[PDB]
Design a protein around this ligand. Structure first.
Ligand code: CLA
Ligand code: CLA
Ligand code: CLA
Ligand code: CLA
Ligand code: CLA
Ligand code: CLA
Ligand code: CLA
Ligand code: LHG
Ligand code: LUT
Ligand code: BCR
Ligand code: SPH
Ligand code: PLM
Ligand code: DAO
Lengths: 219, 75, 39, 222, 227, 213, 84
């Protein structure tokens, strides 16, 4: 469907996976002699994980600048995404309730619990619903697909009642996630090249596109 | 005609069972020691991968892992 | 663990541990008793 | 100390890679016999990317730090490598071409970079070793040459070469059939490849010894 | 069938509508264990009743005494006569003893249903106690339970939930602005575009600590705002 | 069925839940053999009991130190006792080694031959050294209250409580050592410093734990 | 930079390399060359599905772009090296 399709990649891409456009010139989903991490289940799971994380990242990288330009948030906040303490050489914010290492330890424990339980459910489907977890195991059963667990919390409003609706929503999620991944890559590249925020780059380009682009930002 | 990533999953099991059996790689040394010569043979045919088996795939895999161990030593 | 102990019981591993123990004992003896030439 | 810790981590990674490739994911024989793809990667990726990465480090760290060391600056007062890599003011002061950014590279105005990419030759009169600007330019040229050479053999597309075709096309009247069967010999015998690699590797090692005493590349080495 | 909390969602199998105010809402599945469900029902009833009492107390206190801050009303210098500057230790002792007695009786009623209905001193004075958390008798002297108890319990739990939300709103409003709910409502009515959560947030009017007579009690806001 | 140290991971074969505090935690398979597991069970029980005594003593002494009682810290109590009281340190060490040697030697030879110490060769005492299980030496001397010879369910619950409290005390002693080597003060002094300011007084701000901070 | 000799030479070089392969004058992903420099069919493992009338795939675009860039960079640096 897309550009770069091949007869070899079409042997294993029959539209079963969500967002299958037959774009695989590097042949990473061939089930013939597959192992380790280069296999269809892990690759699709990693793509949906990167998709959701990049969606949150793109929104979180462009939200404080847009909210600051709109006057909703004060002037103490509204800093660039790479100047919020992420990279201390690029700038750090000292307005938090604690230093970034304490918050990092909190993130270590929190992310370890979430990610390790997620991994254990991927390795053993449904194993996160038997052991006692303060009664929360009733919603950690998931389904056969580790990428789409569902349940009372992960599917709060029980959307996608029909299989077609669920397929449509899955395709929308993967496309928005790919767009967000490209946006995050663009955010990093613009931060290294221009040295400013992404919304600032968008504004500067909208003012005069001929004098504001990658060709004029070289030197 | 197609260049891809061909692989086999879990061919050899990670265990210490063979660590207690010296000379398991060769059919001649698998019997055990009877003379001191055997001991020297145990060290002379250790890396001789094309003598343990005639399968080229096994030799290539052993070579790959030997290269990784060597780079670990260098690091 | 039985296989690991059997591997540690082989001649080179036992020789390494024994020589390390003997060398360490001799080194510590010469360290706490410097230059012993006579009794 | 940080480099030592990184080396220990890399050693553990190499050991884990060996264990993983022997007991968890062992490649088939057809994966090892992809000499065309292997050569393309070792030429472009390994050699070319390694030379390009070292050229980048030499341009951004070795060149300004060593220039300041040769200028008489105390090692404690020299800016940290990340300090030189974060702002363009210090680099522009030490090298005016840095004030133009990467713009002269894309505009085919490489001559503007004539302050850290030259052909000085000889040796540094202060340190006695080769000029690091010349070594950086050397690594840039080497990286471009190896990256160009890394797109010679065909892998999964029509463009590229087949080594068996080139070997079979070389045949004269005084040699009979020629290189027929050499490709099958080198793609199935590890000892033959080991012989060729060991011979060229040892020859290059001796060449390295001669080139290193003759042209000392490190400061205060001669 | 009853109306659920979300259109199109399917209620849990353990929520068939027997208990009052069952909207089929349990995203965490904390009601899977029947014992845990009964304990959480008792906890929700206690929270609902205490929140209704607190909300009504704050509102009536702000109406009758508009110059006394409900947040700082716990200080001994703000107590009315003849309880001003009273020793808080004896006050805490009184509350601890009485609350401990009644809560132990209620807990025993939860563990062993219908086992503490009788008065331990005067025999014959018992309570009917139809369900758990609903003793009645001396607790309901007006006798309003001899009728439609389902809709009455539904109204009770819904009003309690609304009061829980209301009291937490009171706490956050007093923490961000520094005034009672009625005063904050009047201030917002004076200028809706100037006094809202968009500008009052980020400021924590609660001090770092308070020195109640001799000992110092540490205090904090619910969010890391400006002290 | 039973909870494990890593949910979703199957418990090993050498850990079937018969022992107290069994969570199937053995990634290195150090206790795969039955005799080795028996020895390690007794070692863990002794370690936990000593750690419990140490944690209780350290906490009580630090409590007396925080209040105006003059109690020395746990890292200086030895010097304070040896210098305050005319007590010879090697003599005390030899006496302690003699008593511990006799007790631990009887325990060791009982581990080698269960019930051997009940022969009556030690002052005629027989049932006081018969032993109940591995690492659980019941009798009128070790358990004068008779809690190990009555109400089996309560006994198993107490066994689980003992192993869990022992592991917690071992972690507590390790924390005491790390806290003293990183901050330099006692455990209660660190607790007071943390309670005074938890957002800025922790391991991420001591300047020793995280070197890149 | 637009309209200069460098830009014009690079654009002409890339366009010339792209026009030769598409019109059957340079090696492509579909047509290989022999030892006598004669076009002939290939055995590509990818087999990129293209809609072009001559089968010009994206791989051909990348290869011709790299070839034109090399020829253009060499020509510009050669002219700048001879003072012309
Ligand atoms: C001799 C070197 C070597 C070679 C030839 C291979 C080859 C292979 N590996 Mg392997 N591996 C190696 C070393 C090597 N590995 C080492 C040192 C480790 C430890 C870190 C691993 C750990 C590893 C795992 C866990 C897996 C493989 C897998 C594979 C197979 C396919 C995946 C792949 O590599 O494609 C392409 C590679 C990628 C898509 C990811 C590469 C991204 C890396 C992280 C980029 C950074 C490294 C880069 C060189 C540094 C540049 C600097 C940068 C900061 C700019 C393939 C046959 C997979 C497999 O078994 O497939 C069957 C698999 O699951 N490898
Ligand atoms: C057969 C040859 C030979 C002999 C007889 C000796 C003898 C001696 N060497 Mg020598 N040495 C030799 C070879 C020899 N060495 C070689 C080949 C080397 C080169 C590697 C050395 C290098 C060497 C060094 C560097 C030193 C000695 C030292 C000594 C003296 C140490 C005594 C001691 O260890 O304390 C007593 C040992 C014990 C109490 C252990 C007793 C064993 C058990 C525990 C008790 C059983 C006893 C009943 C000793 C008289 C040391 C010295 O100070 O010289 C005077 C010393 O520094 N040697
Ligand atoms: C702890 C993990 C582990 C375990 C339990 C095993 C277990 C096993 N491996 Mg394996 N392997 C591992 C990790 C592991 N391996 C790693 C990290 C690598 C990459 C190097 C390999 C690569 C590998 C290959 C290629 C092969 C095995 C084989 C085997 C089987 C028998 C050989 C044997 O173990 O004898 C014990 C061997 C040794 C103790 C020698 C180890 C030497 C190390 C690697 C280097 C030492 C360098 C030394 C310090 C430098 C010398 C200087 C000197 C002065 C000290 C056995 C079941 C063989 C097999 O399956 O039989 C067909 C097989 O051919 N392994
Ligand atoms: C651009 C891609 C690339 C790169 C950088 C390498 C690099 C390397 N290969 Mg590899 N290889 C590749 C592609 C690549 N290969 C492909 C496509 C194939 C299949 C045709 C192979 C098949 C192959 C075989 C059979 C062997 C190698 C070996 C080696 C190592 C030689 C040791 C040395 O002297 O170099 C310098 C050493 C270093 C620079 C040490 C640092 C290592 C870093 C991490 C580079 C590793 C990059 C590599 C792509 C792994 C990243 C993938 C990710 C999954 C981790 C070297 C690290 C030998 C080996 O196994 O070594 C273990 C060997 O026997 N390769
Ligand atoms: C491989 C070698 C290498 C590397 C790594 C670098 C790297 C760098 N060079 Mg450099 N350079 C090199 C070779 C290299 N160079 C060579 C060979 C030459 C001689 C021709 C030069 C000459 C040169 C000059 C003259 C200058 C640089 C400059 C720079 C810096 C900025 C690059 C830039 O201008 O914007 C380019 C934009 C990018 C590279 C995009 C970055 C992409 C990022 C990493 C994406 C991250 C996205 C990620 C998903 C974000 C999510 C993270 C999450 C946690 C939120 C940079 C660190 C500049 C400088 O340092 O100023 C003093 C500068 O002026 N270089
Ligand atoms: C949704 C993401 C988000 C995040 C992560 C933050 C984070 C932060 N805000 Mg903020 N804020 C947000 C949204 C957000 N805000 C919005 C949408 C508004 C408009 C109403 C504000 C208005 C605002 C003000 C007026 C102030 C902050 C301030 C702060 C900083 C101090 C923390 C604090 O307790 O202040 C306040 C906590 C909140 C506002 C709770 C935000 C929860 C949102 C609404 C979830 C959706 C902190 C880093 C303070 C500051 O600038 O630092 C000096 C401050 O004065 N924010
Ligand atoms: C418009 C066409 C054109 C022109 C006029 C030039 C002109 C020039 N080129 Mg150039 N070049 C071109 C196209 C052109 N090139 C193309 C298409 C490529 C491929 C991309 C190259 C690649 C190239 C390289 C790699 C080099 C030149 C170099 C040079 C200069 C060296 C003069 C000489 O006689 O070499 C030298 C004469 C010799 C006998 C040396 C050969 C020694 C070997 C080993 C024998 C010269 C001014 C050199 C340079 O950089 O300029 C300083 C050089 O290194 N060119
Ligand atoms: C040197 C001359 C190279 C000789 C050379 O390569 O000439 C070229 C000649 C021509 O060979 P072909 O053209 O048939 O070779 C084509 C195929 O081998 C692929 O290129 O090769 C031989 O003569 C091989 C016979 C050995 C010649 C024996 C001469 C001995 C002199 C060597 C002594 C060195 C001093
Ligand atoms: C298709 C294909 C096929 C063939 O065959 C093969 C190949 C070629 C390989 C392919 C391709 C691929 C690709 C393209 C890839 C890429 C990816 C990406 C880009 C990702 C990102 C990705 C990205 C990501 C994750 C990101 C994320 C982010 C985040 C979290 C962020 C966060 C944050 C925020 C909020 C804000 C602040 O201020 C900061 C922080 C805190 C930091
Ligand atoms: C008309 C038409 C069209 C259009 C088309 C086009 C327009 C295409 C294109 C395209 C292009 C426009 C492309 C481009 C490209 C580029 C490339 C591919 C590149 C590159 C690079 C490189 C590789 C380089 C290298 C180097 C360096 C880096 C330095 C040194 C030197 C050298 C050169 C080596 C369509 C289809 C729509 C429709 C119909 C017809
Ligand atoms: C005035 C001297 C009083 C005794 C001083 C201490 C002596 C210690 C002797 C303790 C006796 C140990 C054994 C006692 C009883 C034995 O079980 C029976 N004789 C064995 O049949
Ligand atoms: C300062 C050290 C003093 C030590 C005092 C020694 C007291 C005797 C203890 C020796 C116990 C030996 C146990 C027998 C050996 C064994 O059980 O295998
Ligand atoms: C380094 C490459 C040298 C190539 C030499 C080519 C000589 C042309 C020989 C052509 C013979 C033929 O095709 O009939």
């Amino acid at each position: 469907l897309y550009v770069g399709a091949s007869q070899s990649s079409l042997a294993y891409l029959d539209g079963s996976l969500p967002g299958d456009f037959g774009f695989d010139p590097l042949g990473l989903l061939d089930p013939v002699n597959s192992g380790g991490f280069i296999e269809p289940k892990w690759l699709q799971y990693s793509e949906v994980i990167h998709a959701r994380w990049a969606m949150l990242g793109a929104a979180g990288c462009i939200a404080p600048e847009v909210l600051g330009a709109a006057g909703l948030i004060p002037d103490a906040t509204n800093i660039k995404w790479f100047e919020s303490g992420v990279i201390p050489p690029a700038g750090s914010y000292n307005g938090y309730w604690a230093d970034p290492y304490t918050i990092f330890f909190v993130e270590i424990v929190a992310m370890q619990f979430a990610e390790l339980r997620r991994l254990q459910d991927f390795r053993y489907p449904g194993s996160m619903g038997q052991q006692y977890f303060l009664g929360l195991e009733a919603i950690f059963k998931g389904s056969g697909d580790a990428a789409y667990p569902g349940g009372p919390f992960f599917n709060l409003f029980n959307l996608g009642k029909t299989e077609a609706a669920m397929k449509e929503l899955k395709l929308k999620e993967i496309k928005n996630g790919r767009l967000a991944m490209l946006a995050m890559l663009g955010y990093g590249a613009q931060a290294v090249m221009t040295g400013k925020g992404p919304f600032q780059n968008l504004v500067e380009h909208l003012a005069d596109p001929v004098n504001n682009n990658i060709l004029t930002n070289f030197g | 005609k197609k260049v891809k990533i061909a692989v086999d999953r879990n061919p050899v099991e990670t265990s210490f069972e063979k660590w207690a059996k010296p000379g398991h790689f060769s059919r001649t040394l698998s019997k055990g020691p009877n003379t001191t010569t055997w001991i020297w043979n145990l060290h002379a045919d250790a890396h001789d991968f094309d003598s343990h088996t005639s399968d080229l795939e096994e030799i290539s895999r052993k070579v790959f892992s030997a290269h990784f161990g060597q780079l670990g030593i260098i690091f | 663990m039985k296989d690991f102990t059997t591997y540690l019981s082989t001649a080179p591993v036992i020789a390494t541990i024994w020589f390390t123990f003997t060398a360490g004992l001799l080194i510590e003896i010469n360290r706490y008793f410097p230059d012993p030439l006579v009794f | 100390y940080t480099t030592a810790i990184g080396g220990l981590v890399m050693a553990a990674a190499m050991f884990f890679a060996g264990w993983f490739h022997y007991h968890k994911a062992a490649p088939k024989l057809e994966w090892f016999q992809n000499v065309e793809s292997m050569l393309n990667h070792h030429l472009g990726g390994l050699l070319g990317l390694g030379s390009l990465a070292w050229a980048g480090h030499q341009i951004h760290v070795s060149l300004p730090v060593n220039k300041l060391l040769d200028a008489g600056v105390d090692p404690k007062e020299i800016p940290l490598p990340h300090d030189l890599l974060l702002n363009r003011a210090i680099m522009a002061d030490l090298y005016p071409s840095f004030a133009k950014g990467i713009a002269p590279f894309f505009t085919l105005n490489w001559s503007e970079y004539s302050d850290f990419l030259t052909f000085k030759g000889g040796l540094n009169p202060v340190t006695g070793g080769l000029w690091l600007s010349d070594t950086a330019h050397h690594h840039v040229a080497i990286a471009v040459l190896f990256l160009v050479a890394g797109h010679m053999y065909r892998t999964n597309w029509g463009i590229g070469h087949s080594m068996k075709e080139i070997l079979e096309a070389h045949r004269g009247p005084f040699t009979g059939e020629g290189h027929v069967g050499l490709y099958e010999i080198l793609t199935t015998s590890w000892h033959a490849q080991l012989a060729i690699n060991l011979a060229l590797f040892g020859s290059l090692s001796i060449i390295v010894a001669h080139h290193m005493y003759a042209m000392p590349p490190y400061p205060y080495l001669a | 069938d009853r109306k659920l909390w979300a259109p199109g969602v399917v209620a849990p199998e353990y929520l068939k509508g027997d208990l009052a105010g069952d909207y089929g809402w349990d995203p965490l599945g904390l009601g899977a264990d029947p014992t845990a469900l009964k304990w959480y029902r008792q906890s929700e009833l206690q929270h609902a009743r205490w929140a209704m009492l607190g909300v009504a107390g704050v509102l009536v206190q702000e109406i009758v005494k508009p110059d006394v801050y409900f947040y700082e009303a716990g200080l001994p210098q703000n107590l009315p006569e003849p309880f001003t500057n009273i020793n808080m230790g004896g006050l805490l002792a009184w509350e601890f003893i009485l609350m401990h007695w009644v809560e132990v009786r209620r807990w025993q009623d939860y563990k062993n249903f219908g086992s503490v209905n009788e008065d331990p001193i005067f025999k014959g004075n018992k309570v009917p106690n139809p369900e758990m958390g609903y003793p009645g008798g001396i607790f309901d002297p007006f006798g309003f339970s001899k009728g439609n108890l389902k809709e009455l319990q539904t109204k009770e739990i819904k009003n309690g939930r609304l009061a829980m939300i209301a009291y937490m709103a009171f706490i956050l409003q007093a923490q961000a602005t520094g005034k009672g709910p009625l005063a904050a409502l009047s201030a917002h009515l004076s200028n809706p575009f100037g006094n809202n959560i968009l500008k009052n947030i980020g400021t924590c009017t609660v001090p770092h600590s308070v020195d109640v007579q001799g000992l110092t009690i540490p205090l904090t806001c619910l969010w890391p705002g400006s002290q | 069925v039973r909870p494990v140290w890593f949910p979703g991971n199957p418990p090993p074969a050498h850990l079937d839940g018969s022992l107290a505090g069994d969570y199937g935690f053995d990634p290195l398979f150090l206790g795969q053999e039955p005799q080795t597991l028996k020895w390690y069970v007794q070692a863990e029980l002794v370690h936990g009991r000593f750690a419990m005594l140490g944690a209780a003593g350290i906490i009580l002494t630090s409590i007396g130190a925080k209040v105006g009682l003059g109690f020395p810290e746990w890292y200086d109590a030895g010097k304070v006792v040896v210098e305050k009281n005319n007590i010879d340190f090697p003599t005390l060490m030899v006496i302690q080694f003699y008593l511990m040697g006799w007790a631990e030697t009887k325990r060791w030879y009982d581990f080698k031959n269960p019930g051997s110490q009940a022969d009556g060769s030690f002052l005629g005492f027989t049932e006081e050294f018969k032993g109940l299980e591995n690492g659980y030496p019941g009798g009128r001397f070790f358990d004068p209250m008779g809690l190990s010879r009555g109400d089996a369910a309560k006994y198993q619950e107490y066994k689980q409580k003992e192993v869990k409290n022992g592991r917690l005390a071992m972690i507590a002693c390790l924390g005491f050592a790390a806290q003293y080597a990183a901050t330099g003060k006692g455990p209660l002094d660190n607790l007071a410093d943390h309670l005074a300011d938890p957002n800025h007084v922790n391991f991420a701000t001591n300047g020793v734990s995280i070197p890149i901070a | 930079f637009i309209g200069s000799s460098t830009n014009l030479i690079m654009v002409a070089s890339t366009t010339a390399t792209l026009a030769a392969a598409r019109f059957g004058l340079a090696p492509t992903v579909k047509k290989n060359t022999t030892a006598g420099l004669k076009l002939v069919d290939s055995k590509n493992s990818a087999g990129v599905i293209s809609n072009d009338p001559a089968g010009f795939t994206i791989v051909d675009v990348l290869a011709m772009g790299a070839a034109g860039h090399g020829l253009g960079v060499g020509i510009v640096l050669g002219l700048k090296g001879i003072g012309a």
